[PDB]
Amino acid sequence: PHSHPALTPEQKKELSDIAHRIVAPGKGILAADESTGSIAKRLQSIGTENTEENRRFYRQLLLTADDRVNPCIGGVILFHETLYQKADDGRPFPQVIKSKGGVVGIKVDKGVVPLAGTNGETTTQGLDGLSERCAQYKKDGADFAKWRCVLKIGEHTPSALAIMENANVLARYASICQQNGIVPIVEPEILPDGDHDLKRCQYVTEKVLAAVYKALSDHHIYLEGTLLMPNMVTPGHACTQKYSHEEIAMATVTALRRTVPPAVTGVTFLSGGQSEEEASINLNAINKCPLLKPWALTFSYGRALQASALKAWGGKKENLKAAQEEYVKRALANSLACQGKYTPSGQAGAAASESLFISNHAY
Contact residues toward a second copy (CB under 8 A) are 1-7, 110, 113, 115-119, 123, 125-129, 131, 155-156, 158-161, 164-165, 168, 172, 175-176, 178-179, 199-200, 203-204, 206-207, 210-211, 213-214, 217-220, 223-224, 254, 256-263, 292-294
Give 7's DSSP letter.
S
Q: In whole angstroms, how close is the CB of 179 to a second copy at the nearest point? A: 5
Name which of 9 and 47 has its Cβ closer to a second copy. 9
Shortest distance in whole angstroms from residue 153 CB to a second copy = 9
- Chain-centroid distance of CA 208 in Å reads 17
In terms of Cα–Cα distance, which of 269, 239, 236, 216 is closest to 157?
236
For residues 98 and 106, is the Cβ–Cβ distance under 8 A?
A: no
Name the β-bridge partners of 151.
190
d(CA 147, CA 295): 21
Q: How far is the CB of 131 from a second copy (least distance, A)?
A: 7
Between 50 and 339, CB nearer to a second copy = 339
- Return the number of the residue (36 or 118) whose C-beta is nearest a second copy: 118
Query: Which lies closer to a second copy via its Cβ, residue 115 or residue 350?
Result: 115
| Least distance from a second copy to the Cβ atom of residue 35, Å | 16
C-beta of 248 vs 281, nearer to a second copy? 248
- How far are the Cα atoms of 196, 227, 267, 315 from residue 94, in angstroms, in the given order? 41, 21, 24, 24
Angle in degrees, CA 88, 92, 96, rounded to 5: 90
Is the CB of 206 or the CB of 277 nearer to a second copy?
A: 206
In total, the chain counts a number of residues equal to: 363
Q: Output 292 or 351, the one with its CB closest to a second copy.
A: 292
Backbone angles phi, psi at 348, to 5 degrees: -150, 15
Task: Report how far residue 35's alpha carbon sits from residue 19's, in angstroms, rounded to the nearest whole number.
Answer: 24
Rounded CA-CA distance 3/1 in Å is 7
Q: How far is the CB of 344 from a second copy (least distance, A)?
A: 27
Instruction: Name which of 94 and 188 has its Cβ closer to a second copy.
Output: 188
User: What does the alpha-carbon distance between residue 281 and residue 337 come to, in Å, rounded to a whole number?
Assistant: 7
| β strands within 159-295, DSSP E | 183-191, 227-228, 266-269
What is the smallest separation between the CB atom of 6 and a second copy, expressed in angstroms? Answer: 3
DSSP strands (E only) in 53-182: 73-78, 103-107, 112-114, 122-124, 144-152
In the bound complex, what is the minimum distance in angstroms from residue 76's beta carbon to a second copy? 26
Extended beta strands in the chain, E state: 28-31, 73-78, 103-107, 112-114, 122-124, 144-152, 183-191, 227-228, 266-269, 296-301
Residue number with CB closer to a second copy (90 or 117): 117
Chain CA centroid to CA 299, Å: 7
